[PDB]
From a paper:
The membrane-anchored SNARE (soluble N-ethylmaleimide-sensitive factor acceptor protein receptor) proteins provide the energy to drive membrane fusion in various cellular contexts, such as intracellular trafficking and exocytosis. Supercomplexes of NSF, α-SNAP, and either a syntaxin tetramer or one of two binary complexes of syntaxin—SNAP-25 reveal atomic details of SNARE processing and show how sequential ATP hydrolysis drives disassembly. Six NSF protomers come together to form the active form of the enzyme, a homo-hexamer.
Substrate-bound reconstructions reveal a flattened D1 ring in closer proximity to the D2 ring and a strikingly different ɑ-SNAP—SNARE spire structure than observed in the 21bin20S complex under non-hydrolyzing conditions. Again, syntaxin is bound within the pore of the D1 ring. We observed a nearly symmetric ɑ-SNAP—SNARE subcomplex comprising four ɑ-SNAP molecules coating a four-helix bundle. Even without further processing, this structure was recognizable as a parallel 2:2 syntaxin—SNAP-25 sub-complex formed by two syntaxin H3 SNARE domains and two SNAP-25 SN1 SNARE domains; this binary 2:2 configuration was previously observed in crystal structures of syntaxin-1 H3 and SNAP-25 SN1 domains and was unexpected as we prepared the complex with full-length proteins, implying that two independent SNAP-25 molecules contribute their SN1 SNARE domains to this complex. Presumably, disassembly of the binary 2:1 complex had occurred and was followed by reassembly of the 2:2 binary complex before vitrification. Of the five 22bin20S classes with the 2:2 binary SNARE complex, all are found with syntaxin in the D1 pore, while two are observed with the N-terminus of the SNAP-25 SN1 domain in the pore. Most strikingly, no SNARE substrate-bound classes show an F protomer as fully engaged as those in non-hydrolyzing classes; in all but one class, F is ADP bound, SNARE substrate disengaged, and sits between engaged A and E protomers. Three distinctive “grips” are observed in the case of the classes with the 2:1 syntaxin—SNAP-25 complex identified under non-hydrolyzing conditions (top), and two are observed in the case of the classes with the 2:2 syntaxin—SNAP-25 SNARE complex identified under hydrolyzing conditions (bottom).
Author numbering:
A (entry chain D): 205 to 740
B (entry chain C): 212 to 638
Amino acid sequence: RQSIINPDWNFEKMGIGGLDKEFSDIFRRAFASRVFPPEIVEQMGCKHVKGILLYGPPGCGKTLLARQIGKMLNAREPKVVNGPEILNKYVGESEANIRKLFADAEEEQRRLGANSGLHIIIFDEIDAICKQRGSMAGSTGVHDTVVNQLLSKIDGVEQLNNILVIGMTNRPDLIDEALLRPGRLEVKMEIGLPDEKGRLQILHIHTARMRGHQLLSADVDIKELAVETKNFSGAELEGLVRAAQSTAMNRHIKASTKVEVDMEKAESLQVTRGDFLASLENDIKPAFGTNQEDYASYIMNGIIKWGDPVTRVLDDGELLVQQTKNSDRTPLVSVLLEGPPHSGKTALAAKIAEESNFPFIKICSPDKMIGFSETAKCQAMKKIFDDAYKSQLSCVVVDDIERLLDYVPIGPRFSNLVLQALLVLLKKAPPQGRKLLIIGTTSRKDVLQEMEMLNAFSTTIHVPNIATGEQLLEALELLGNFKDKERTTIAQQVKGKKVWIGIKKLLMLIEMSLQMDPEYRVRKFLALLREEGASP
Amino acid sequence: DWNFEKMGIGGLDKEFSDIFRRAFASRVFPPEIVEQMGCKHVKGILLYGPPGCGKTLLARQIGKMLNAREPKVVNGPEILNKYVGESEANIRKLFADAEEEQRRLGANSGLHIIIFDEIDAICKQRGSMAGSTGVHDTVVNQLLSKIDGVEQLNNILVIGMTNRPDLIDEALLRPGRLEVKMEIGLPDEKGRLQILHIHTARMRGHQLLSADVDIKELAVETKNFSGAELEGLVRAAQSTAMNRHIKASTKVEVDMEKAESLQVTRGDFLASLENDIKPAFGTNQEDYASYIMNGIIKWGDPVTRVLDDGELLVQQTKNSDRTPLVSVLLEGPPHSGKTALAAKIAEESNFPFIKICSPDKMIGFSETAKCQAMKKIFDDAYKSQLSCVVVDDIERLLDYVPIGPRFSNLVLQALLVLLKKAPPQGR
Ligand SMILES: Nc1ncnc2c1ncn2[C@@H]1O[C@H](COP(=O)(O)OP(=O)(O)OP(=O)(O)O)[C@@H](O)[C@H]1O
Ligand SMILES: Nc1ncnc2c1ncn2[C@@H]1O[C@H](COP(=O)(O)OP(=O)(O)OP(=O)(O)O)[C@@H](O)[C@H]1O
Ligand SMILES: Nc1ncnc2c1ncn2[C@@H]1O[C@H](COP(=O)(O)OP(=O)(O)O)[C@@H](O)[C@H]1O
Ligand SMILES: Nc1ncnc2c1ncn2[C@@H]1O[C@H](COP(=O)(O)OP(=O)(O)O)[C@@H](O)[C@H]1O
């Protein structure tokens, strides 16, 4: 008759946010049978469920759940096994340990029967103990014995209906098949990364005890914090809050002359939104996706509009991203950029990518696998593409294809594994209701034409060079160098002919020119420009 | 009674300030504001950086600074046994006292410290290393569960140190377990002055040092010189000086008469610099002697032109932004002298760090070895404000016997991608 739930409980009291569906689901397939009047359940001819598995990315609050589910229940305090703590040197004692503590339920069932209080067991990181049978061909084989002991103990000739087991892990692909099946560990559950609304919920939950004592300036607002915080885990948000508190407090302390803390400014303690922002940009750094630093490294000297082609390219990219965002017949898209060397394809790609405002971005550049072998490169590609599938919309910019695969003209000689890997990957649609964009760059179109790759890409874009005196003058004006008189003579000796050069080249030459004396700089520069004389 | 000058670690002010701010702040501010707050205290610190910056000294002194029980030390993989289920027992024994103190007092417990020298030795990425016995993965799991398990702790602080900050498993470096991670790098001129001041304090106290020696010259003349190496130098020169007085070849003898007055002069320091100490991230005079054999003679105009062009490029790299990387190629017919000249240019660039990579020290190697050596040299070069690296006879480094032709591609790819890699922003 006694209720299995504590008379005083609340879903807001436990303090978990953003996992409402998950909490609702388990209860539905778990506690639904233990609260209803027993009579129908006895007429029901049913056995309560035994076993639940929680698997997902690290530090995602997986454990918090176990703690507050143990606390919620109106039953005995559960038993916990902090990983592989049930190993003994003597022969036959691991099995005795694992069998012990599994028999209080047996005793109470054989005593009362059908009226015993629920028992609860916890097996943190089950993966240490339970592993593939026939694997781990090391010595003493104790693990293969213990797994069989467990299997039998939880389900066998003997029946038990008052025990609930819970296990958390980080590698759900290593557990024994049998264990994870009906009757044994059942209703497999997966904890995923949060959305922005979940981030807001977590931030509000963690920022409730400070607003309740007039400790926070009205300047700070949470919507921004939820916006900038991208690819963040609850632990990361808590750490950010802690760092903000620490830096705010530090202002009142004095060091290098022993420890001093004023008790006057103390009473006027306040935290600043700007302080939060500074801490966010300085110390905390997520480990899932890309960060502003990557873009700041790729697009070094920014972007300048020396002509209409750049605007045209940007417009085309905007149209592509909009289509992929809103289109539904075509869950996949791909665009190939082309241009002669030293045109700046990398920077334009990076910029269009950044402008998408997508959740999951990533940049796979050749200079992150120096000296590797073909297999390592393939596995890296596999992992990078694998991560994207677990989101809703994303864009990956593969750069320098003609390097990922090597096309030394001699021969020719080009690895073959990488090529096929890519040619396949670029036609594998993701799981249902998800969207991806694959932006590639190159500098040798004809070779790609020969390799029958040019028909896999959906479309193409062309990036030209600077090929007009007016454009060169505009670029020089924008940069702000060799101006005034200098500019006066340069325009004099250039407009009466045509030019052909890439922006990078121009930058290095301008630099070199300035490094000479101020009595002959223009001469130097103009002289150099002639040396680089060519045309299509 | 503690002060920052007493410790004697000079030149790491910013790092110490940040560590104090991030790890000893909530324990100093009055516990009333902490009660009204929910600032759960941090429980992880990691240190990494090239050898010779004394990561250990830091730890030793910071441990001393505390006033709540001496620390517990683990020396490398000390906690290991052959009986099953024993290393984990040793691991668990570490936290018993803290657990008991927390249970008995709760919020009125003192601080417990744990130090893990060469953490990498035992802690490593899971799922990769061949744990034939399996102790490594088991220990990793045990630590991960104990540090942050269902039960919560608030009075422990772990400091780890390692020169290889990649083999550490990612699961341990999330904000929950280990938050503050710091790099310790080479020192600057001011740091060198600070260190030299410290190491040579008692000596000044007892008038054992001649005024003939100056400290500013010592600081300037020594560049990219690891601090430890500064201490080493001081000690070596001192030893030389004090030996001068002893006169004994076969039968040991001490000339007390000459020992009445003892002082150290510049000459000892100069000799020690020339002969005794040899920096690693510094520059060495041997290579220049081994490459420019018969010197340089001006037999015609072209040489001056070439030298002038070289220094122009040097200037550009030293005094420009927007172009942190510049590369120049020299070529000519064979047996012409297109090797030494590059070394002369490098010696004239006056950069703190210079290095020459040749096929001479790789003969008989295989491809992977050649790629690894190149990567290592450039990785080491990446750690300084300025640098100058020479590659001699790219041809042989790739192998190109004309028949076929026949050459290795892996090396070519490597060198190619390499030449277009930005230095760590700022150098
Ligand atoms: N409008 C612009 N478009 C492109 N790049 C620009 C522009 N304005 C300035 N830049 C600078 O020019 C350079 C663009 O070329 P980048 O350095 O990315 O090499 P790349 O030519 O793409 O490389 P690769 O040789 O691998 O093809 C970057 O420094 C970028 O900051
Ligand atoms: N003015 C000079 N220019 C060049 N070399 C000089 C000059 N004066 C003397 N030498 C000597 O000439 C030799 C240069 O030989 P070096 O190894 O450069 O020839 P190389 O054929 O370019 O080399 P490698 O076969 O490695 O390419 C050295 O002994 C150097 O000291
Ligand atoms: N929904 C959530 N509500 C509150 N805190 C959360 C939530 N999700 C994650 N966290 C934070 O994550 C941390 C718990 O991580 P945990 O799940 O124990 O890591 P692991 O799964 O590796 O054991 C806590 O500090 C907590 O503040
Ligand atoms: N800032 C410093 N000031 C003075 N001496 C220093 C400083 N940093 C390091 N040292 C010296 O360098 C050496 C470092 O030794 P150790 O700590 O064992 O090195 P590591 O931990 O890097 O192997 C010691 O002689 C130490 O006194």
